Design a binder for this molecule. Structure first.
Ligand SMILES: CCC(CC)(c1ccc(OCCCCC(=O)O)c(C)c1)c1ccc(OC[C@H](O)C(C)(C)C)c(C)c1
Length: 250
Protein backbone atom coordinates (compact mmCIF):
# COMPACT_ATOMS: atom_id res chain seq x y z
CA UNK A 1 0.00 0.00 0.00
CA UNK A 2 1.05 3.59 -0.67
CA UNK A 3 -0.86 5.90 1.72
CA UNK A 4 -0.68 9.59 0.89
CA UNK A 5 1.20 12.00 3.15
CA UNK A 6 -1.15 13.45 5.76
CA UNK A 7 -1.60 17.24 6.12
CA UNK A 8 0.54 17.01 9.30
CA UNK A 9 3.26 15.03 7.38
CA UNK A 10 3.22 17.71 4.60
CA UNK A 11 3.52 20.43 7.33
CA UNK A 12 6.47 18.52 8.95
CA UNK A 13 8.25 18.35 5.51
CA UNK A 14 7.63 22.08 4.81
CA UNK A 15 8.93 22.99 8.31
CA UNK A 16 12.10 20.88 7.94
CA UNK A 17 12.86 22.22 4.44
CA UNK A 18 12.44 25.83 5.67
CA UNK A 19 14.63 25.06 8.72
CA UNK A 20 17.37 23.65 6.42
CA UNK A 21 17.14 26.65 4.03
CA UNK A 22 17.65 29.02 6.97
CA UNK A 23 20.55 27.06 8.46
CA UNK A 24 22.54 25.78 5.48
CA UNK A 25 24.41 28.19 3.18
CA UNK A 26 25.19 26.34 -0.08
CA UNK A 27 27.58 29.15 -1.12
CA UNK A 28 29.88 28.60 1.96
CA UNK A 29 30.05 32.46 2.22
CA UNK A 30 31.12 32.56 5.93
CA UNK A 31 34.19 30.32 5.38
CA UNK A 32 36.51 33.35 4.85
CA UNK A 33 35.67 34.31 8.53
CA UNK A 34 37.29 31.12 9.92
CA UNK A 35 40.94 30.88 10.95
CA UNK A 36 42.82 30.28 7.68
CA UNK A 37 43.57 26.81 6.36
CA UNK A 38 47.30 25.97 6.44
CA UNK A 39 48.65 23.09 4.35
CA UNK A 40 52.31 22.07 5.01
CA UNK A 41 54.54 19.43 3.36
CA UNK A 42 53.27 15.99 4.48
CA UNK A 43 53.20 13.69 1.43
CA UNK A 44 54.06 10.80 3.76
CA UNK A 45 51.19 11.52 6.14
CA UNK A 46 53.57 11.37 9.14
CA UNK A 47 51.56 11.01 12.40
CA UNK A 48 54.47 12.65 14.37
CA UNK A 49 54.55 15.64 11.98
CA UNK A 50 50.74 16.03 11.88
CA UNK A 51 50.55 16.06 15.70
CA UNK A 52 53.48 18.50 15.85
CA UNK A 53 51.79 21.06 13.56
CA UNK A 54 47.97 20.34 13.43
CA UNK A 55 48.12 22.87 10.55
CA UNK A 56 44.49 22.40 9.41
CA UNK A 57 43.05 22.09 12.93
CA UNK A 58 42.19 25.79 13.60
CA UNK A 59 40.29 26.05 10.24
CA UNK A 60 38.50 22.67 10.59
CA UNK A 61 37.63 23.32 14.28
CA UNK A 62 36.09 26.70 13.20
CA UNK A 63 34.22 24.87 10.41
CA UNK A 64 32.83 22.17 12.76
CA UNK A 65 32.01 24.75 15.45
CA UNK A 66 30.08 26.87 12.83
CA UNK A 67 28.34 23.66 11.61
CA UNK A 68 27.33 22.70 15.20
CA UNK A 69 25.77 26.21 15.60
CA UNK A 70 23.73 25.60 12.42
CA UNK A 71 22.69 22.12 13.74
CA UNK A 72 21.54 23.69 17.06
CA UNK A 73 19.35 26.12 15.02
CA UNK A 74 17.97 23.38 12.78
CA UNK A 75 17.16 21.10 15.76
CA UNK A 76 15.13 23.87 17.45
CA UNK A 77 12.83 23.89 14.36
CA UNK A 78 12.24 20.09 14.38
CA UNK A 79 8.51 19.50 15.21
CA UNK A 80 8.42 18.16 18.75
CA UNK A 81 12.06 18.98 19.63
CA UNK A 82 10.93 21.94 21.78
CA UNK A 83 8.52 19.51 23.65
CA UNK A 84 11.58 17.75 25.18
CA UNK A 85 13.23 18.98 28.38
CA UNK A 86 16.24 21.31 27.91
CA UNK A 87 18.45 18.52 29.43
CA UNK A 88 17.30 15.95 26.75
CA UNK A 89 17.67 18.57 23.93
CA UNK A 90 21.35 19.06 24.96
CA UNK A 91 22.14 15.34 25.39
CA UNK A 92 20.69 14.74 21.85
CA UNK A 93 22.62 17.65 20.32
CA UNK A 94 25.96 16.71 21.85
CA UNK A 95 25.62 13.00 21.09
CA UNK A 96 24.56 13.48 17.43
CA UNK A 97 26.76 16.53 16.58
CA UNK A 98 29.51 14.72 14.59
CA UNK A 99 27.01 12.46 12.78
CA UNK A 100 24.83 15.40 11.70
CA UNK A 101 28.00 17.31 10.62
CA UNK A 102 28.93 14.24 8.49
CA UNK A 103 25.42 14.21 6.94
CA UNK A 104 25.46 17.93 6.22
CA UNK A 105 28.96 17.76 4.69
CA UNK A 106 27.54 15.47 1.97
CA UNK A 107 25.96 18.41 0.04
CA UNK A 108 29.49 19.84 -0.73
CA UNK A 109 31.04 16.40 -1.22
CA UNK A 110 31.71 15.55 -4.84
CA UNK A 111 32.43 12.26 -6.48
CA UNK A 112 34.26 14.16 -9.28
CA UNK A 113 37.44 13.92 -7.11
CA UNK A 114 36.29 12.63 -3.69
CA UNK A 115 36.61 16.06 -2.04
CA UNK A 116 34.37 18.47 -0.14
CA UNK A 117 34.36 21.44 -2.56
CA UNK A 118 33.34 24.61 -0.68
CA UNK A 119 34.36 27.29 -3.21
CA UNK A 120 37.93 28.14 -4.25
CA UNK A 121 40.97 25.83 -3.85
CA UNK A 122 41.47 27.22 -0.27
CA UNK A 123 38.09 25.73 0.74
CA UNK A 124 38.50 22.45 -1.14
CA UNK A 125 38.97 19.71 1.49
CA UNK A 126 40.49 16.28 0.98
CA UNK A 127 41.48 13.20 3.10
CA UNK A 128 44.93 14.91 3.37
CA UNK A 129 43.35 17.96 5.14
CA UNK A 130 41.66 15.72 7.76
CA UNK A 131 45.00 13.94 8.42
CA UNK A 132 46.58 17.48 8.77
CA UNK A 133 44.00 18.09 11.58
CA UNK A 134 45.49 15.02 13.40
CA UNK A 135 43.05 12.26 12.41
CA UNK A 136 44.06 8.81 11.23
CA UNK A 137 43.03 6.41 8.42
CA UNK A 138 40.82 4.36 10.80
CA UNK A 139 38.40 7.37 10.67
CA UNK A 140 39.11 8.71 7.14
CA UNK A 141 38.72 5.44 5.17
CA UNK A 142 35.16 4.66 6.48
CA UNK A 143 34.31 8.42 6.33
CA UNK A 144 35.01 8.60 2.57
CA UNK A 145 33.20 5.23 2.07
CA UNK A 146 30.20 6.77 3.92
CA UNK A 147 30.20 10.01 1.84
CA UNK A 148 30.20 8.05 -1.44
CA UNK A 149 27.48 5.57 -0.32
CA UNK A 150 25.34 8.46 0.91
CA UNK A 151 25.94 10.53 -2.26
CA UNK A 152 24.93 7.56 -4.45
CA UNK A 153 21.49 7.41 -2.70
CA UNK A 154 20.69 10.68 -4.62
CA UNK A 155 18.49 11.82 -1.76
CA UNK A 156 15.75 14.36 -2.35
CA UNK A 157 16.17 17.42 -0.11
CA UNK A 158 13.01 16.20 1.73
CA UNK A 159 14.75 12.86 2.53
CA UNK A 160 18.05 14.56 3.51
CA UNK A 161 16.25 16.89 6.03
CA UNK A 162 14.19 14.02 7.50
CA UNK A 163 17.39 11.90 7.84
CA UNK A 164 19.14 14.69 9.83
CA UNK A 165 16.06 15.15 12.04
CA UNK A 166 15.78 11.36 12.72
CA UNK A 167 19.53 11.29 13.51
CA UNK A 168 19.20 14.06 16.12
CA UNK A 169 15.97 12.78 17.72
CA UNK A 170 17.27 9.29 18.62
CA UNK A 171 15.94 7.64 21.83
CA UNK A 172 18.98 5.31 22.06
CA UNK A 173 21.55 7.95 23.09
CA UNK A 174 23.31 7.58 26.49
CA UNK A 175 22.03 9.88 29.25
CA UNK A 176 18.55 10.66 27.82
CA UNK A 177 15.65 10.88 30.33
CA UNK A 178 12.37 10.61 28.38
CA UNK A 179 13.31 7.96 25.81
CA UNK A 180 9.56 7.27 25.12
CA UNK A 181 8.80 10.89 24.11
CA UNK A 182 12.03 11.04 22.02
CA UNK A 183 10.89 7.78 20.31
CA UNK A 184 7.36 9.20 19.58
CA UNK A 185 8.95 12.35 18.00
CA UNK A 186 11.34 10.11 15.97
CA UNK A 187 8.53 7.74 14.94
CA UNK A 188 6.48 10.68 13.63
CA UNK A 189 9.56 11.69 11.54
CA UNK A 190 10.36 8.08 10.47
CA UNK A 191 6.73 7.49 9.29
CA UNK A 192 6.87 10.78 7.30
CA UNK A 193 10.05 9.56 5.61
CA UNK A 194 8.75 6.01 4.83
CA UNK A 195 5.46 7.49 3.44
CA UNK A 196 7.41 10.12 1.46
CA UNK A 197 9.68 7.50 -0.23
CA UNK A 198 6.78 5.19 -1.30
CA UNK A 199 4.65 8.19 -2.43
CA UNK A 200 7.31 10.50 -4.07
CA UNK A 201 10.55 8.68 -4.85
CA UNK A 202 10.48 7.16 -8.39
CA UNK A 203 12.12 3.80 -9.25
CA UNK A 204 14.82 2.36 -9.46
CA UNK A 205 14.81 -0.49 -0.41
CA UNK A 206 15.72 3.23 0.02
CA UNK A 207 14.37 3.47 3.61
CA UNK A 208 16.42 0.37 4.64
CA UNK A 209 19.51 1.94 2.94
CA UNK A 210 18.95 5.23 4.87
CA UNK A 211 18.54 3.27 8.19
CA UNK A 212 21.85 1.51 7.43
CA UNK A 213 23.49 4.98 6.96
CA UNK A 214 22.35 5.90 10.52
CA UNK A 215 24.03 2.71 11.85
CA UNK A 216 27.21 3.59 9.84
CA UNK A 217 27.10 7.06 11.54
CA UNK A 218 27.11 5.35 14.99
CA UNK A 219 30.40 3.55 14.12
CA UNK A 220 31.95 6.73 12.71
CA UNK A 221 30.88 8.65 15.86
CA UNK A 222 32.63 6.05 18.10
CA UNK A 223 35.83 6.17 16.02
CA UNK A 224 35.72 10.04 15.92
CA UNK A 225 35.39 10.06 19.76
CA UNK A 226 38.52 7.79 20.08
CA UNK A 227 40.49 10.09 17.75
CA UNK A 228 39.35 13.29 19.46
CA UNK A 229 40.67 11.81 22.77
CA UNK A 230 44.19 11.35 21.14
CA UNK A 231 44.05 14.88 19.70
CA UNK A 232 43.05 16.27 23.12
CA UNK A 233 46.34 14.85 24.59
CA UNK A 234 48.44 17.04 22.29
CA UNK A 235 49.86 19.96 24.38
CA UNK A 236 48.22 23.31 23.51
CA UNK A 237 45.53 21.58 21.35
CA UNK A 238 42.73 23.51 23.18
CA UNK A 239 43.84 26.90 21.59
CA UNK A 240 43.38 25.29 18.14
CA UNK A 241 39.77 24.28 19.05
CA UNK A 242 36.76 26.39 20.21
CA UNK A 243 34.78 26.50 23.48
CA UNK A 244 31.84 24.84 21.70
CA UNK A 245 34.03 22.10 20.26
CA UNK A 246 35.63 21.56 23.71
CA UNK A 247 32.20 21.17 25.41
CA UNK A 248 30.60 19.01 22.67
CA UNK A 249 33.49 16.54 22.33
CA UNK A 250 35.03 16.89 25.78
C1 LIG B 1 36.93 18.25 6.04
C2 LIG B 1 35.92 17.11 6.08
C3 LIG B 1 34.75 17.15 7.13
C4 LIG B 1 33.90 15.84 6.75
C5 LIG B 1 32.73 15.48 7.68
C6 LIG B 1 33.76 18.32 6.96
C7 LIG B 1 32.82 18.74 7.96
C8 LIG B 1 31.89 19.75 7.66
C9 LIG B 1 31.81 20.35 6.38
O1 LIG B 1 30.78 21.28 6.33
C10 LIG B 1 29.42 21.22 6.80
C11 LIG B 1 28.82 22.50 6.12
C12 LIG B 1 29.17 23.89 6.62
C13 LIG B 1 27.99 24.66 7.24
C14 LIG B 1 26.85 23.80 7.78
O2 LIG B 1 26.95 22.56 8.47
O3 LIG B 1 25.63 24.44 7.44
C15 LIG B 1 32.66 19.95 5.38
C16 LIG B 1 32.57 20.70 4.05
C17 LIG B 1 33.67 18.97 5.68
C18 LIG B 1 35.46 17.10 8.50
C19 LIG B 1 35.83 18.29 9.17
C20 LIG B 1 36.54 18.22 10.37
C21 LIG B 1 36.83 16.95 10.93
O4 LIG B 1 37.47 16.80 12.12
C22 LIG B 1 37.06 17.73 13.15
C23 LIG B 1 37.85 17.43 14.39
O5 LIG B 1 37.68 16.15 14.76
C24 LIG B 1 37.45 18.39 15.58
C25 LIG B 1 36.09 18.01 16.19
C26 LIG B 1 38.63 18.24 16.57
C27 LIG B 1 37.51 19.88 15.20
C28 LIG B 1 36.46 15.75 10.33
C29 LIG B 1 36.78 14.38 10.99
C30 LIG B 1 35.77 15.86 9.09
Amino acid sequence: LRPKLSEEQQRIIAILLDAHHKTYDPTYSDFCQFRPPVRVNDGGGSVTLELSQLSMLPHLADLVSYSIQKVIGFAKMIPGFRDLTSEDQIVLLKSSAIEVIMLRSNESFTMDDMSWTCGNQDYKYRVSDVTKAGHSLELIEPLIKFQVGLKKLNLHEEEHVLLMAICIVSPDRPGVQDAALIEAIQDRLSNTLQTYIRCRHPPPLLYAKMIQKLADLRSLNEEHSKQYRCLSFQPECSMKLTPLVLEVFG
